[PDB]
Amino acid sequence: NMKRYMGRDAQRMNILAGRIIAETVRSTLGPKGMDKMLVDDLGDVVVTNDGVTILREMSVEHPAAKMLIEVAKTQEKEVGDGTTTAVVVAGELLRKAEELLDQNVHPTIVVKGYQAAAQKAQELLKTIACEVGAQDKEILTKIAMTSITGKGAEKAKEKLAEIIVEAVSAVVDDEGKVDKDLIKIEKKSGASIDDTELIKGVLVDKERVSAQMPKKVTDAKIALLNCAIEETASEMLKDMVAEIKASGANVLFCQKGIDDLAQHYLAKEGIVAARRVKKSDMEKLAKATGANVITNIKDLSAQDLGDAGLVEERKISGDSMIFVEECKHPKAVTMLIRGTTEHVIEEVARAVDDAVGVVGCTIEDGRIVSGGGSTEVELSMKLREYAEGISGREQLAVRAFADALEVIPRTLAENAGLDAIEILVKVRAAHASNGNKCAGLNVFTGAVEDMCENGVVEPLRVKTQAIQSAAESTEMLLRIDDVIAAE
Amino acid sequence: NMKRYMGRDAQRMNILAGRIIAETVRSTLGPKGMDKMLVDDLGDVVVTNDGVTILREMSVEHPAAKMLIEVAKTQEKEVGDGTTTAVVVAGELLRKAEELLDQNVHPTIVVKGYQAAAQKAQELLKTIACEVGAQDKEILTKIAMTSITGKGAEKAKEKLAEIIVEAVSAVVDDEGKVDKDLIKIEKKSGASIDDTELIKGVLVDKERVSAQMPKKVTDAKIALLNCAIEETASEMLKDMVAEIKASGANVLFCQKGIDDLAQHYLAKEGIVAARRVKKSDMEKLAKATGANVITNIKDLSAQDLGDAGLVEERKISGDSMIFVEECKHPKAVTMLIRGTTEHVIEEVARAVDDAVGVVGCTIEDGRIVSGGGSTEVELSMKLREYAEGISGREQLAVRAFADALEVIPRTLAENAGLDAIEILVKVRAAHASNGNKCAGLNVFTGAVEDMCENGVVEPLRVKTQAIQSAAESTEMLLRIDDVIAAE
Amino acid sequence: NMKRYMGRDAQRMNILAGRIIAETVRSTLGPKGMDKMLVDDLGDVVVTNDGVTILREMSVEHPAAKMLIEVAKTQEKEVGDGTTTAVVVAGELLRKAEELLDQNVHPTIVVKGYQAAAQKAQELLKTIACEVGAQDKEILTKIAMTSITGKGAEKAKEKLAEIIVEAVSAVVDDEGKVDKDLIKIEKKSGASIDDTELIKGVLVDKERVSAQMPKKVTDAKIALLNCAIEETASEMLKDMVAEIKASGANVLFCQKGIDDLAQHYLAKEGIVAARRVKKSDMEKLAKATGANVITNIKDLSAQDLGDAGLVEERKISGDSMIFVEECKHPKAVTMLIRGTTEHVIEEVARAVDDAVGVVGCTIEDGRIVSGGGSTEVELSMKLREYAEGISGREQLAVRAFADALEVIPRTLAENAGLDAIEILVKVRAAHASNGNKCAGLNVFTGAVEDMCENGVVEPLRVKTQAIQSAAESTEMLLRIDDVIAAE
Ligand SMILES: Nc1ncnc2c1ncn2[C@@H]1O[C@H](COP(=O)(O)OP(=O)(O)O)[C@@H](O)[C@H]1O
Ligand SMILES: Nc1ncnc2c1ncn2[C@@H]1O[C@H](COP(=O)(O)OP(=O)(O)O)[C@@H](O)[C@H]1O
Ligand SMILES: Nc1ncnc2c1ncn2[C@@H]1O[C@H](COP(=O)(O)OP(=O)(O)O)[C@@H](O)[C@H]1O
Ligand SMILES: [Mg+2]
Ligand SMILES: [Mg+2]
Numbered sequence A, B, C: 001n002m003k004r005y006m007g008r009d010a011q012r013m014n015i016l017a018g019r020i021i022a023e024t025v026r027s028t029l030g031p032k033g034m035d036k037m038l039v040d041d042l043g044d045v046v047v048t049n050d051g052v053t054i055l056r057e058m059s060v061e062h063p064a065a066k067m068l069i070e071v072a073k074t075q076e077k078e079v080g081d082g083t084t085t086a087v088v089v090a091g092e093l094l095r096k097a098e099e100l101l102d103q104n105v106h107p108t109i110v111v112k113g114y115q116a117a118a119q120k121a122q123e124l125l126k127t128i129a130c131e132v133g134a135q136d137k138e139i140l141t142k143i144a145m146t147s148i149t150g151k152g153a154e155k156a157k158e159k160l161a162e163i164i165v166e167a168v169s170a171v172v173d174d175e176g177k178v179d180k181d182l183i184k185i186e187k188k189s190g191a192s193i194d195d196t197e198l199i200k201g202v203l204v205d206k207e208r209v210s211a212q213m214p215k216k217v218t219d220a221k222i223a224l225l226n227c228a229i230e231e232t233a234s235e236m237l238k239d240m241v242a243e244i245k246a247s248g249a250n251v252l253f254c255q256k257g258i259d260d261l262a263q264h265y266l267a268k269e270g271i272v273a274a275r276r277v278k279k280s281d282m283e284k285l286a287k288a289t290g291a292n293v294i295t296n297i298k299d300l301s302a303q304d305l306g307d308a309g310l311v312e313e314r315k316i317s318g319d320s321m322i323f324v325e326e327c328k329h330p331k332a333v334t335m336l337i338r339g340t341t342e343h344v345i346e347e348v349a350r351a352v353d354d355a356v357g358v359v360g361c362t363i364e365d366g367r368i369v370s371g372g373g374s375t376e377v378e379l380s381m382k383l384r385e386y387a388e389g390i391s392g393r394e395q396l397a398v399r400a401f402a403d404a405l406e407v408i409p410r411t412l413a414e415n416a417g418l419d420a421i422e423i424l425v426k427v428r429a430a431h432a433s434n435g436n437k438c439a440g441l442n443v444f445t446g447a448v449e450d451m452c453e454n455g456v457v458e459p460l461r462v463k464t465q466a467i468q469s470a471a472e473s474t475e476m477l478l479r480i481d482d483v484i485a486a487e
């Protein structure tokens, strides 16, 4: 009863189990990286280059691996991009870790020295991260463009980065954070990808409750009701219906029900209304228009109304919805994504989510670094010298940790097709205490260039979060020498 | 019907079953000790170095072993640390016990002399335990730091011991005990471990009930309602809502429901409120702010309000919670634990629980001893001489009890990789009636040092509780000669 | 249809099935006797030296044996100690009985002569039982100490016997019996066995119903309510709450519910209260404090209040309970048992139950005899001479009944390790019409001593009850010649 793995078996089991989910996403890394198509047991397909979703949505069973998935799962949570790289490095730390274990270094010494180097690399980044203005709306767009590439250069549509930057800039809650949930993302087919647009307002999946109501209003004034406009059979409802026309509202969104008598009295007045709107769609409307959620229909002031420069019922991609667009001061915004087929749309969307993360991350943080595997080769040589000022075995650990980070430049080369080993040498010479700190491999060029100038940039949060969660988890894995599997 | 084990078979069965769950945690002992990863039948993993949880959360079936798990289960209950050592010694008393049984010593003679020595070692410790001031806030931190190490030297973050000491010192109930439950422990991801912090107040997993309410208040005055703020459809609620503004409260935590009419009247007043807060979260708030749990909304005095220097709704690690931080005189406190992944966080937490135990134990007790296996080698040689002043066989027992305790120094060496046998001799010479009583093996040094000075200290409760529950249970096991297993 | 045993087969079946559950507890007899660990089908373990529980809690199926368990089950019921010896003798009467049956003595002659000797030994004991004072508090403690030994000499803690004697002396219902149920036995972990103490009052597994109430009161006055203190929403409860403050009661134990309005009015007054207390805990409190169970809250007189010199809420072993200790004139008492692990506690408890029995038995009876197998060797030689004054076969029976009783001295020797046969001769010479009647084997000494002087004493009820239930049941077994087993 029933399965147990001892010592060098249990370590090899885990270190291997780790390297394997790592090697499973190695191939998506970079712009010249490939996508995984991922059916389940229901013929349900899902195609993506996004690291974490790949990991999440596959049946991974082995307990060691279950925990590298932890790393990716919290990278996405605390950044948005760089989920693959956090997992990939975590694998490469386990790889280098067994080169020392098979040299009879004690696990606790390895994990000591890994910690030591994770510590260093954290303040070593702090210092090699350029500062940026929270509204440097030009740099914000080089960041959002560097994010979309890597999901393929061909998604890197210029006028799409711009849309995103603008749309994250809108929902900034002074001060001074970005609520990644204030940007609503909607997907509807069309003949598009290029037709994706910013809607400064809200998209509601309802329709005017009475066909007799207006199907367009401009410069409308919006009344949001958390109440339920009842009726009966004796017009107890000309009250409720004329108290709303009393505030000046030509549009009304109700979360509860609107009885059939108070549907005719609204149509009769010229007021458009929708019943049973999602509670989530009610807060979306509360914020984007500048409105107020009223529970008491009597207490409906004339300043609890929002303002949108258009409220219209359209048929878009077959379905008919209520657009509340062209708002004045949006604290909620909608990204309307569009593409010919459904999974084409769904992956453009995962790309936008990664953008909106790294953009939110720059605004929030203020510091950024240079992509292309740049600040890994930097961060790795610096770590390599810090490594000499270390007496004892734990030194080997620290060099291994330093060599580990070179896995990002390395695999970025691989997928592009280039000769990983050479390119790594060129990029390692160009960091020799002089410049560049920004010297990295351009997988299109083919040769090493200046990434800060080619516009290849990434929030600092991407490499810090990634390097520490990769450290912390592999550290714990290495401490393990016995496993106890049942069933 | 069905299975029975006789005499030397039943004893060998139990003594063996015992030594086996003992040998199952031998490997976690000390800083250079390893962790067990522990899946169940649901792919559910849990990694830990904490003795008892390891034992608890594995399907141990054999009845003998079920009872060494008793020892660990009460060690954790009455101390917090030293669960592995209580079990480990318990095993080693069973090991030495059969060396006498296989020499035809009567079980009742063994158990007589084991009792005799357990008796002695109890007053032998009393005398070799240094005194300490309940607020010797320096020593308290050497104690909380000796605890976290042993779960790996790498968790031994200096500024984490300090946080814990401070936080256990706060919740001291004059006089004069520590309620290990007054320190709330919360876990939320972040890019951290280092980001774990002390919050002098409470963390509430709720959110302002009306979006229109303030989302920050400073120097707030807090009204806790054990009542239910009802409504209907005729503002019977401007009463309830203005009776609360009557006491001066700009924040309100309600355990029951807050009707939708009395949610609008609060938002209108500037008062923040949360409905249906855990009853446990209500007592946490009662104590930490200095508030009062009121059942009658009418009897809401203006001194039943607590005081916190900030009440804010934040999004931390995705989820949005209500922080009631920076309080004045906390009789409740929150340890916010943080780490990149989840099991990384979860084990830093088990480490903090052990700290909080041994810290609470020093404050409570006032006496401490020297770790590193120090007071075991002391306690063992002293016991060995007490052993000569014993006529009869029961002497053999007492020596075996004395030799038993050397298992802690021994296995601490093992895991470190050092030569157990030698190290035991060095440490045994350094106790020869002269000094040191504090002379123990430093597993980093490699050589025997003065543990009291290296800051390796442990509440007295760790070695007294452990040595006696190890004595009491193995005493009972040895009395057993027949077993009757069914099914 | 289906199984039947005839004549010499059915007798051999039963006489054998009897001797087998007898031989199953032979090993627990005496201080140098061993314990049985006893799992069931649920991994549920239970370790004990207590005869009856061993028998009870094992799946004994055979019908003959089902009935020796009868003997043990009523020994415990009518005495408390000497459950093993009643069963043991019962077995040894069956053993001797078949030596006569295999000599063609008619069953009815055997059972005639066994009855004859059981009759004799009953009045033969009457005369050789020393008298004692119901309050000879010194002898009472030699009795309660002789009881605990035999469950191992190592439980024989001196200051434990004393506690028990005192605690049985308290609950004496003049005149003049001991209600073994007036002494409440509670078990809570601690680092103890030595920490077990007498609490002159009651332990209640509840907690102050309102956190705002006092958590200590001294010299308190206690009001026990068999009523239900209701409420509603209009303070119909300041009535009920101030009628209680009218009698002068600062503590209140309610069996039914205390509504949430009448919980705030009590907290406000300074009165501590607990709702939904066990009905059994209500009678415990009725008697120990000197209180009165009131159903009508109006009829709450100022003399229906008890008196305890402390009522406090403590956390003891994790759980928090309401101690009502240090009472004045207890007619209920609590034995707080403590020990490191749970089964360690549970068997100390079974030891206390046996003590409380034999102590209650001396007080009640007033007569006692000398243990160590002493009055068995006496009782056996006397029976042996009575045996010569018997004409007919029925004489053989009577000698066999006399030889039977020597099984107690014999097995006490066995387990100690001594040579049963010799020791039996020594002890049989020392009874040769001169002294001693008190001459028995000390299993520590190794040689035969004067048991009355060594403080080895046992209520008379132990040897009378035991010798007659052993006689009555084996008498009935022997009368059986056909069995009819189904299924
Ligand atoms: N133009 C570019 N040339 C070379 N590398 C790039 C370029 N743009 C982005 N990258 C790199 O591609 C990587 C992104 O891989 P990706 O497929 O997005 O997975 P993840 O974002 O989780 O690492 C980042 O390391 C970034 O450094
Ligand atoms: N710096 C140190 N050097 C040597 N031993 C240590 C040091 N710090 C703690 N210890 C020892 O490590 C042991 C702790 O083992 P641990 O893994 O914490 O299990 P437990 O705490 O249940 O015994 C204690 O005996 C303590 O004496
Ligand atoms: N100090 C002693 N020396 C020898 N025999 C003893 C001593 N104390 C008690 N006994 C005997 O031990 C027996 C008790 O056995 P025990 O394990 O208590 O089962 P039970 O009490 O049901 O007979 C009693 O016959 C008593 O005569
Ligand atoms: Mg990307
Ligand atoms: Mg520990």
Ligand SMILES: [Mg+2]
Binding pocket: C081, C082, C147, C148, C149, C150, C151, C354
């Ligand atoms: Mg007994």
